[PDB]
């Protein structure tokens, strides 16, 4: 289970789509960039995953 | 074992299933599968003789024979009493009616102390039409409709809606039949089945019993079982005739010589009868042998006495 | 009869008024209920009554396995719908081929 | 009744059906094999541009501004009814997974 770093040293392109509850647009007080520009089920996934 | 000269190993197949093909691969499951590899040599058996089945193995003869058919509930449905009257109407609405009589009542109570009274007389009297009106209307339509629809009894007695489910066991050869049928009335009973699988499917035939009585639902079965499964439940009831007929057989691998006994060695005891006074045996059939008029008759029965307690 | 008895006897109890504007009011408000449960459990069963027609097209039977329709054995009528194309037909022969003997 | 099931619609030509367009339910009935699911396909197909829909919420449009029934997920429907409560689900899961 110390798998978890043990990928920590790289990166991989994430495609999606967009749709509620799962991957949208964040909202904005200020504008939005990158891979903080969304919310979402699986947005919120990926971090934990 | 006794008539061949054989001996045997009991063994329940692994899945639990009657077995039939995959639907692509061409491959079977269950018994089937096992017979087919050889993997056993005899499935004495609840078999069902299909073409399918002789297409690939080969079963004894057809010796207890059968035929698809239904299985139900009594049910032994009522509600009968007052708790039933009230529903042409709202049970306010039914309420209000006596706060609604004695508005007019109370009119005279108090218009004495005959033009006036007569004229509203009308609206008590072309009033309570409307009720009594929509009373009938409201009462029939309840009726027509919960008559035209039911009782029915019969395969296309289901096929007639969806409001009574069905279905049998996976790799059923019913259920293949039902599958492997082109009669619109049974063809379109499938094409019910195969939508809602999981709801209709169940893994037993004492699993689906409980399908029976644990919601309006009808189930597929072989005739032999079903008398039985009702004599061991006064609970349950069958419908229809037979779909259909076949028998049980004796599982063998196809044309594996085996049955050549078996081809004989039934026939005798059931040609003596013994299998029959088996079939006695098991089939011991211990038991089971084979309204809403009156909710209003004690509102009748009710101010009868209320006079009583009038003036003595 | 009954009911209508133990009401009508009352007037034996008084020989040997609100008494009275009770009884027949719920008498009436009951006994016109019987009336309409008499009408609709009637109606109830006429219009179930105007709904068969049983048949007129073969289509009538093809849907309805609750009768036996077959014919002639080697006839062109057997030849016809076991060779025939139709839906209905082919339908209605996997009917009788159901049921061959 | 008027629906309970998706054979409820699949009989009656009156109301629009379709899903997502290159989703998987779209893939299913077009690859689908039951009877009904095949003549549930063959429906949208002859009204490929019109029925199907490129967005979930582009086919919640059509509900709300047709005679439309989505044939969504789940747990988007579960959701989508959580959310906005003008609309409701039809029977149980076509297809598990
Ligand atoms: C479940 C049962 C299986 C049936 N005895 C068979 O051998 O396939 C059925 O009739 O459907
Ligand atoms: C009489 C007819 C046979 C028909 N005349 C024929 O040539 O096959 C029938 O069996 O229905
Ligand atoms: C959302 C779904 C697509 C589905 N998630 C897929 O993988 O194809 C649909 O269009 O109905």
């Known amino acids: ?49 | 074992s006794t008539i061949l000269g054989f001996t045997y190993e009991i063994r329940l197949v692994e899945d639990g299933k009657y077995g039939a093909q995959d639907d692509v691969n061409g491959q079977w499951n269950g018994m089937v599968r096992e017979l087919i590899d050889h993997k056993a040599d005899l499935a004495v058996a609840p078999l069902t003789i299909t073409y399918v089945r002789e297409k690939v193995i080969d079963f004894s003869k057809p010796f207890m024979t059968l035929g698809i058919s239904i299985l139900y509930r009594k049910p032994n449905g009522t509600n009968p009493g007052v708790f039933s009257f009230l529903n042409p109407l709202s049970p306010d609405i039914w309420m209000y009616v006596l706060l609604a009589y004695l508005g007019v009542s109370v009119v005279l109570f108090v218009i004495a102390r005959a033009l006036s009274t007569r004229i509203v007389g009308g609206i008590w009297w072309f009033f309570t039409l409307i009720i009594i009106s929509s009373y009938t209307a409201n009462l029939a339509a309840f009726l027509t409709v919960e008559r035209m629809e039911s009782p029915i009894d019969s395969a296309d007695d289901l096929a007639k809606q969806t409001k009574i489910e069905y279905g049998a066991v996976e790799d059923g050869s019913t259920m293949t039949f039902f599958k492997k049928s082109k009669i619109s009335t049974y063809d379109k009973m499938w094409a019910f089945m195969s939508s809602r699988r999981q709801s209709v499917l169940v893994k037993s035939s004492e699993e689906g019993i409980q399908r029976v009585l644990t919601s309006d639902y009808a189930l597929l079965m072989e005739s032999t079982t079903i008398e039985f499964v009702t004599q061991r439940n006064c609970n349950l009831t069958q419908i229809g005739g037979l779909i259909d007929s076949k028998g049980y057989g004796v599982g063998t691998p196809m044309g594996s010589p085996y049955r050549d006994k078996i081809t004989i060695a039934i026939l005798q005891l059931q040609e003596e009868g013994k299998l029959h006074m088996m079939k006695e045996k098991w089939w011991r059939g211990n038991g089971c042998p084979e309204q809403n008029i009156g909710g209003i008759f004690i509102v009748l029965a009710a101010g009868l006495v209320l006079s009583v307690f009038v003036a003595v």
């Open chain 1, 1 to 49: 289970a110390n798998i978890t770093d043990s990928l920590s040293n790289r990166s991989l392109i994430v495609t999606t789509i967009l749709e509620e509850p799962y991957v949208l647009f964040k909202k904005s007080d200020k504008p939005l960039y990158g891979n903080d520009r969304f919310e979402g089920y699986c947005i919120d996934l990926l971090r934990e995953l």
